[PDB]
Structure 1
């Protein structure tokens, strides 16, 4: 599991929320992460107290090496994940994600951010070291099948906002996940350097065609 989250907070928030619906202090500095790895703290978007918040949350979830993904096919009915599907929905924004067929970087053709569905342990603001978030995954569709069998569940801006709502049930979230998934025809992709494999590599070049 690996993705890029390189731009500024405002770059990611433009499609999701007007200024007054956010409690996300202004910071003009790019997040600047070209190679986001599991087991690190990642800026995670969620809704509480009627506002969007951005909290640094552990990418991983360990029961009693940590899990990093939750399959959409089973998460909502999972004995482990069903409560998180109900109460711990979030969004992890990104520029695109990496997968290894030879690594590829996958991103929206229109250049807009991807809003990846996530589930995790609320309250997110507690900075838990073990009970963090997971990225929800789906089966690869269309051209993506030739790269890998899985992909992140990516939601449209409308669906991402709905997904995060505390007034939305697990059942409603399952409907939103189905109808709001961004299909593969909306993405482009290209091979990138093999350097992305080593997490010590963090340069801007990692997302460029090779």
Structure 2
């Protein structure tokens, strides 16, 4: 997808990410770079979103089932990118097609290093081509079986890479969201949907690059029907608008 919501405050988001480690012990993920978390109802590519990844990416002797939550830049910048401005990337890595993921060098190399991450969101927006060229926006989320008390975060399959700015600076962590065919439920809205990891097991297996090979992890990548949506107002169309009105029903 091309737009998400991820508005919850840091403390609330962290509690909504409670998980069981490989011994069945309930835990919260540990933050890296929490100050780069910027809550918004209206996230575009080139902004930072919180993602889950295995602690083994940061500590050599770590339990790969332990989770880090870290803000990462949406728009995978390949490790080999030669220019000094990540936004000057000449091709689009907002998304990564599931069907070609192991063929494309921007995605296959980091995937092969185990750089699998789970992109968090309240949900994603998608636009239906209406006739006129005016498109209708939808907010799309897990069914929620106030509402933001115990909201179920959407967990999208991503790949990340690490890029050292040639002229010096912090290693950039950036991600792409894997896309698949839209399920029947969404097929009238759009032809594509994100690779959604539905439940603790799918999330754990996507993250655990120490225990779960690329072949096994890619079996988790497919359309899913376990999703709902409502139409929203035009307010979300302008990426500068960050209000509860962006995902409010009409």
Residue matched to 2:104: 78
Q: Distance in 2 between matches of 1:139 and 1:127?
A: 33
1:46 to 41, 53, 56: 53
Deviations 1:36-72 (A, max 9, x none): 1101122121012332111221111245454200011
Deviations 1:127-160 (A, max 9, x none): 51xx611001111011201001111111022101
Once the two structures are TM-superposed, the CA of residue 114 in structure 1 deviates from its matched residue by: 1.1
Checking the alignment, whether the CA contact within 8 Å between 2:72 and 2:175 is kept in structure 1 is yes
Residues paired across the two proteins, number? 200
Q: Distance in 2 between matches of 1:122 and 1:164?
A: 17
Q: Distance in 2 between matches of 1:132 and 1:35?
A: 18
Residue matched to 2:208: 165
2:17 to 13, 20, 34: 13
CA RMSD of aligned residues (A): 2.5
Checking the alignment, whether the CA contact within 8 Å between 1:104 and 1:191 is kept in structure 2 is yes
Residue matched to 2:158: 118
- Residue segments in structure 2 that go unaligned for 5+ positions in a row: 57-62, 82-89, 129-135, 145-150, 164-169
Once the two structures are TM-superposed, the CA of residue 9 in structure 1 deviates from its matched residue by: 2.1
Structure having the higher helix fraction is 1
Q: Distance in 1 between matches of 2:240 and 2:220?
A: 37
Deviations 1:184-206 (A, max 9, x none): 2x211111011111111000111
When residues 122 and 12 of structure 1 are mapped into structure 2, their CA distance, relative to the original with a 3 A threshold, is farther
Deviations 1:158-203 (A, max 9, x none): 101110002221111112324xx6x22x211111011111111000
Q: Highest CA radius of gyration, 1 or 2? A: 2
When residues 103 and 16 of structure 1 are mapped into structure 2, their CA distance, relative to the original with a 3 A threshold, is farther
SS in 2 for 1:176: coil
- Residue segments in structure 1 that go unaligned for 5+ positions in a row: none
SS in 2 for 1:159: helix
TM-score (norm 2): 0.72
Checking the alignment, whether the CA contact within 8 Å between 1:76 and 1:174 is kept in structure 2 is no
TM-score (norm 1): 0.84
